[PDB]
Design a protein around this ligand. Structure first.
Ligand SMILES: [Cl-]
Ligand SMILES: [Cl-]
Ligand SMILES: [Hg+2]
Length: 159
């Protein structure tokens, strides 16, 4: 509990900074034609530490739509030059038993990112920039979704 070590390392509207990472690759038509693909992760920082988000499903944990459309797009059919919105469902952060019952606010500097879930006052918020949540008895935060708009599928670099 003593403090005898020189240190000098120095630690908004939110205190959990959520950074989604999406990598979409466009399909190519015929060389044999190549299917598109989509992968990614969601990470967060809280009290100087970084966490990786857990998803309820290994597969089918997200949905792609073209901007101004509600039709589901298979990752195999992604095209370049199309602004996509990726919605990731049943996203959780495990902030550990030491953070159990705490209230934290999730946010994101990137205006293309929005949250859907239950806030700390037990109200449903839909497509919001920031969300105040109550961590459960294990320190876990739960979101209905994270959405990322203006996702562009790149021309494959396998050439
Ligand atoms: Cl980001
Ligand atoms: Cl951020
Ligand atoms: Hg962000």
């Amino acid at each position: 509990h003593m403090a005898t070590t020189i240190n000098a390392s120095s630690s908004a509207k939110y205190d959990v900074d959520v950074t989604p990472s999406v990598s979409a690759v466009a399909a190519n038509t015929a060389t044999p034609a190549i299917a598109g693909n989509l992968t990614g992760t969601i990470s967060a920082s809280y009290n100087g530490k970084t966490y990786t988000a857990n998803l309820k499903a290994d597969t089918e944990n997200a949905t792609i739509t073209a901007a101004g459309s509600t039709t589901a797009v298979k990752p195999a059919e992604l095209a370049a030059g199309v602004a996509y919105t990726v919605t990731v469902n049943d996203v959780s952060f495990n902030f550990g038993s030491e953070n159990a019952g705490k209230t934290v606010t999730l946010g994101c500097a990137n205006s293309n990112v929005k949250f859907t879930g239950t806030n700390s006052d037990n109200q449903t918020e839909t497509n919001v920039s920031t969300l105040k949540v109550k961590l459960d008895q294990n320190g876990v935060a739960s979101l209905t979704n994270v959405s990322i708009a203006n996702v562009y599928a790149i021309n494959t670099t396998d050439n």
